[PDB]
Amino acid sequence: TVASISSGPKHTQKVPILTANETGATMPVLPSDSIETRTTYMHFNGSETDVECFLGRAACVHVTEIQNKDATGIDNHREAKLFNDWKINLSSLVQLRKKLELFTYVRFDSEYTILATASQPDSANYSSNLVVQAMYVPPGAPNPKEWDDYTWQSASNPSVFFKVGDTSRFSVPYVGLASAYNCFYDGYSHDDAETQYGITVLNHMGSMAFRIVNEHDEHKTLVKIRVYHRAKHVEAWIPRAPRALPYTSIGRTNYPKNTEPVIKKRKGDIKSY
Amino acid sequence: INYYKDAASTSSAGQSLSMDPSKFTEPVKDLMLKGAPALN
Amino acid sequence: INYYKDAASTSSAGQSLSMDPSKFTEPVKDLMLKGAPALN
Amino acid sequence: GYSDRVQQITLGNSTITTQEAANAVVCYAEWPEYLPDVDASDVNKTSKPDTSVCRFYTLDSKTWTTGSKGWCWKLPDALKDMGVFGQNMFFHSLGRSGYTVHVQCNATKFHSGCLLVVVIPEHQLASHEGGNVSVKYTFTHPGERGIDLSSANEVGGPVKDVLYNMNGTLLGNLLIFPHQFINLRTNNTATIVIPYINSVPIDSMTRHNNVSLMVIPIAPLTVPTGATPSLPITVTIAPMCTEFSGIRSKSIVPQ
Amino acid sequence: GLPTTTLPGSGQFLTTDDRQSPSALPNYEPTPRIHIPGKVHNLLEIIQVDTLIPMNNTHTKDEVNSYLIPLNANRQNEQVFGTNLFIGDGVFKTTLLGEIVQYYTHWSGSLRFSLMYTGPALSSAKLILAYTPPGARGPQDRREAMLGTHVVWDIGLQSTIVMTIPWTSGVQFRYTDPDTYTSAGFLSCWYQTSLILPPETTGQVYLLSFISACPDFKLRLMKDTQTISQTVALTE
Amino acid sequence: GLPTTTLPGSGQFLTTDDRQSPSALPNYEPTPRIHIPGKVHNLLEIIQVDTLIPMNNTHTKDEVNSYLIPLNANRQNEQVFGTNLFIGDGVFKTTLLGEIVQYYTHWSGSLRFSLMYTGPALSSAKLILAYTPPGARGPQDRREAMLGTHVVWDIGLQSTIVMTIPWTSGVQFRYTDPDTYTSAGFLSCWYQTSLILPPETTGQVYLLSFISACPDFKLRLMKDTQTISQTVALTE
Amino acid sequence: GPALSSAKLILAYTPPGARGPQDRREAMLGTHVVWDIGLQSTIVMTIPWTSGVQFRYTD
Numbered sequence A: 001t002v003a004s005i006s007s008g009p010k011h012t013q014k015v016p017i018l019t020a021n022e023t024g025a026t027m028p029v030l031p032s033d034s035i036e037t038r039t040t041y042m043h044f045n046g047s048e049t050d051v052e053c054f055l056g057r058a059a060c061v062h063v064t065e066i067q068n069k070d071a072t073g074i075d076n077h078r079e080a081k082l083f084n085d086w087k088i089n090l091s092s093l094v095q096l097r098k099k100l101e102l103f104t105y106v107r108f109d110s111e112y113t114i115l116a117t118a119s120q121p122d123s124a125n126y127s128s129n130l131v132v133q134a135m136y137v138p139p140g141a142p143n144p145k146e147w148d149d150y151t152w153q154s155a156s157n158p159s160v161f162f163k164v165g166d167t168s169r170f171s172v173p174y175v176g177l178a179s180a181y182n183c184f185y186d187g188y189s190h191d192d193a194e195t196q197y198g199i200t201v202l203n204h205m206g207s208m209a210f211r212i213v214n215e216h217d218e219h220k221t222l223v224k225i226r227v228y229h230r231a232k233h234v235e236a237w238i239p240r241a242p243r244a245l246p247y248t249s250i251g252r253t254n255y256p257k258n259t260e261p262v263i264k265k266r267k268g269d270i271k272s273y
Numbered sequence B, C: 001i002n003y004y005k006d007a008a009s010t011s012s013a014g015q016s017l018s019m020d021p022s023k024f025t026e027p028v029k030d031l032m033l034k035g036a037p038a039l040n
Numbered sequence D: 001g002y003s004d005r006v007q008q009i010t011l012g013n014s015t016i017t018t019q020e021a022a023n024a025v026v027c028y029a030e031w032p033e034y035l036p037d038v039d040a041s042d043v044n045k046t047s048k049p050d051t052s053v054c055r056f057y058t059l060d061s062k063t064w065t066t067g068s069k070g071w072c073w074k075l076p077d078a079l080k081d082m083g084v085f086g087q088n089m090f091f092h093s094l095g096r097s098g099y100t101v102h103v104q105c106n107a108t109k110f111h112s113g114c115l116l117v118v119v120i121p122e123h124q125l126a127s128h129e130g131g132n133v134s135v136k137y138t139f140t141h142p143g144e145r146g147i148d149l150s151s152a153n154e155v156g157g158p159v160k161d162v163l164y165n166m167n168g169t170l171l172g173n174l175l176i177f178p179h180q181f182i183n184l185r186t187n188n189t190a191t192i193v194i195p196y197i198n199s200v201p202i203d204s205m206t207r208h209n210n211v212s213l214m215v216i217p218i219a220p221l222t223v224p225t226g227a228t229p230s231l232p233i234t235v236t237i238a239p240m241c242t243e244f245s246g247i248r249s250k251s252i253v254p255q
Numbered sequence E, F: 001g002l003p004t005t006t007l008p009g010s011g012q013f014l015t016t017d018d019r020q021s022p023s024a025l026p027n028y029e030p031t032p033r034i035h036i037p038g039k040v041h042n043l044l045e046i047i048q049v050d051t052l053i054p055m056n057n058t059h060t061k062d063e064v065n066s067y068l069i070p071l072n073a074n075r076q077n078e079q080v081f082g083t084n085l086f087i088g089d090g091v092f093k094t095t096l097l098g099e100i101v102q103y104y105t106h107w108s109g110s111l112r113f114s115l116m117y118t119g120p121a122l123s124s125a126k127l128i129l130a131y132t133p134p135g136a137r138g139p140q141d142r143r144e145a146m147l148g149t150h151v152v153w154d155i156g157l158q159s160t161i162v163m164t165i166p167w168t169s170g171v172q173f174r175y176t177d178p179d180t181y182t183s184a185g186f187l188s189c190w191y192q193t194s195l196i197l198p199p200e201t202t203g204q205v206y207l208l209s210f211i212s213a214c215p216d217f218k219l220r221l222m223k224d225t226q227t228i229s230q231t232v233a234l235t236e
Numbered sequence G: 001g002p003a004l005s006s007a008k009l010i011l012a013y014t015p016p017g018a019r020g021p022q023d024r025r026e027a028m029l030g031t032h033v034v035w036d037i038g039l040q041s042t043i044v045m046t047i048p049w050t051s052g053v054q055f056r057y058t059d
């Protein structure tokens, strides 16, 4: 492939460099339309800018935490982090979010990876070996209440059991209602005068539930869960302007008030170098 | 070799090697030729 | 590839792709045609 | 003697002529078309009023003055009250449509000024409150009036800050969306053909707008000496290939 | 010795994975199969059999009576019953259809709603059933109702009427657990003319109503049902 | 039982590796794809669309005005604007090009810089745009500027001028984050003759300026952007 | 008008059955042409025959 062809002096009536940008086109002008060039080859394919590659590496999408401790006398397991759910979403952490929102609709399979590490912040004789259970409680399913509900039987709901310190990995097909995931949605769930606005009203993929299967030892053990997400088989439509201001909420486009100028001011003139 | 039955379980896809910027760079209704005048 | 000798040890079965609700939805002795009167 | 410059669009019982065009943009290089069966889901036969809905409606005019910040209309909202297009809209459960948008602004060879005319698929607005305040329905359904980016923040309304496109992105990059400029010195109209863009084959026309049309002054209007300091901008829009499905009782929407 | 590398996920137990295992009982011979009528292969086979809907839900303890929709002689213009179409909740919820839908997260497809009339043979009646697609309110009077999907039913020799709620939808799947964006409409029924009883006869007559899914139907993404739970393991 | 040996790296999780995994939802059927205009395959497709450069960066809070390069009537010989070419920083940084370049470590290729004139139609002007290849200072006067890559632009009916910064380089890749060894030059613009306004007209006229990449362009070695960060996880 | 002026007018034909339009919104919903004043000096609008009965009276 040639990156530049050889081109010499020109004295024409045919001027490729004068255009009318009002038309909305970006005319494909090249170095050889306005200087004299020599042949050179590309030596490159643009492999690593493919959208599959761009969205295809694992990104941290969520960090939560649960603890193993005596539940005796706990009136609210959920509240003691005896167990914890995660109303699943990808808008939480901003790194991957800015990348996805370069597109309007996106479609891809997900390959999640869950790392769990334990901490024992206060005096323990040892480090116990805990098994985590991660169970996907899709919408319309019983929601745990206690850390050892009938729920956790999860006879019809996919669940994975792995050890703290290890990692669990499993992918799931693209479970969108539509043909693709909306990255934006300028609508409502119905014509209500007070119903929410935006994506949130589409993001309804349930929540992920985590718990330790082990009963309690004499000390307490903090287990912190990190969920990583990798898109595989990516398809993206309609590019948009990149995010400039900071994010404030999962699912709304809102930016913070009295934010700071995002364009760097010159130290000098327009004329400055 | 796929070891698994479902398609979601296969590895990453392989390069589009599609590439056609004209839907974005030249969505004009009447074709523009480089070198010919923009507005006639 | 089965690595094991016994049939119980193989993975899940594969979709019936059988599907015939008529034993449940139309177990009538004399055939009923949709569009013809139910009771003649 | 055909110029890129003169054009005629006849759609239904209405025709537009421009003698100072700058080509026309067809979003994503695709022209509006009806919904194919292979893509269909709802089993209902759809209704295609054709020429009674696919004609040109001219919205009320705006006034560009030296202080203007820009205006924003949503589709199909802007047309919610135009003739039979609008009736069909409130009466069917689902509908689908593409449009021809023609924005008009003429001046003289002594004026200067340049407007950006852009179509943004799925333009989800931001609340000026920040945090996770929502933007109430009425605020994103201004109707033919559209939203005036130089109007004041209101409560439950969107933010109207132009350098941020009403969503946290910079004005400068709106050029990645199908768009055309109106530069008084060149141009006097902008025309964009919009194919139907959605993640579902057909949708509700009232709970979801699928494009915002935005006209934004970028190089300020500058009139000749002792000229009146303003120009009107007119927007005329025509639904094209419209289909309605799931007819019934007639939606009642807030406000 | 062949060199290997183990990946993330090694040692995990995923209740949904499908692999081979050693048999604990090597060489054992299972009992021969004999023929048994009734084999089921797909849950899609059974949700096409219709079952009764406790439409008359207005009681206070479960009773045979909530299966009976009453009809009054001589009323004109008025409304017989109304319900939304959240097949995973409300009237639908205990029906076989409702009961299976609840094992899945998403459903799409047409529903078949039929009414069988049980009044004396010498009576007569004309009813209108109306399906209102998402986007409008439950109809408030027949005029409103009759502008959407409807069937005038004439009570005759042929005892049942089968109304279909054709799949009307933007999005190709809806949630089985009730959700707004994803909502499906309303179903109402009104007198078209009115029920008329023969002489020597009196009182209320009832309609029985059934629900089953059309062959159209799709259910996907299995999950656990809210319809059953427990607090301690059972024993013998 | 086949004999194996595990190598160094067993059990590691590399966020960039690409392998197979069990599906949690065995046998699930995804929604059909329908057609949607606008599919993107390569980021290289989109960085060829031009977007506006806030060249007039001299303000103090972001404003529509930093997109406008002003021009003065009757000045001769003088300089319209100047900038270095660190596409990952400074004026370029918020543009779509700048914004994407920042996802990669290295770039190579030609850039297309165009200027669209917005002054009254009855005015006229001749400007010179000059590209100064690495190795010399930003030019200080047109004489200095005109000895490097330049285009005399004659403002006419054709409203825009497209200047190309041809790839001039020893090393075949440069860093996107500004680096010296790897630096690309300067871009300046001067009056060639001068802007002239018609009668009855007055004041400043402005140029809009765009940037996009030539088909020449290469970007490689993906990394994280300095353009976005956060202090606590967001919530709904 | 002078050659250096400009204007955009809408001409509308309203078929029998409605009143003479009272504002452009009303007018623009019937047969109409947006005329852009340019080099080409004249605009030709056609009142297409819209009628139930195939002849009308001249009086």
Ligand SMILES: COc1ccc(N2CCN(c3cccc(C)c3)CC2)nn1
Binding pocket: A088, A089, A090, A100, A106, A110, A112, A136, A172, A175, A181, A182, A183, A205, A208
């Ligand atoms: C905004 O775009 C997206 C893109 C993907 C996505 N989902 C979240 C839910 N997720 C999922 C689906 C099934 C099971 C589990 C654990 C997670 C798939 C990706 N959510 N939003």
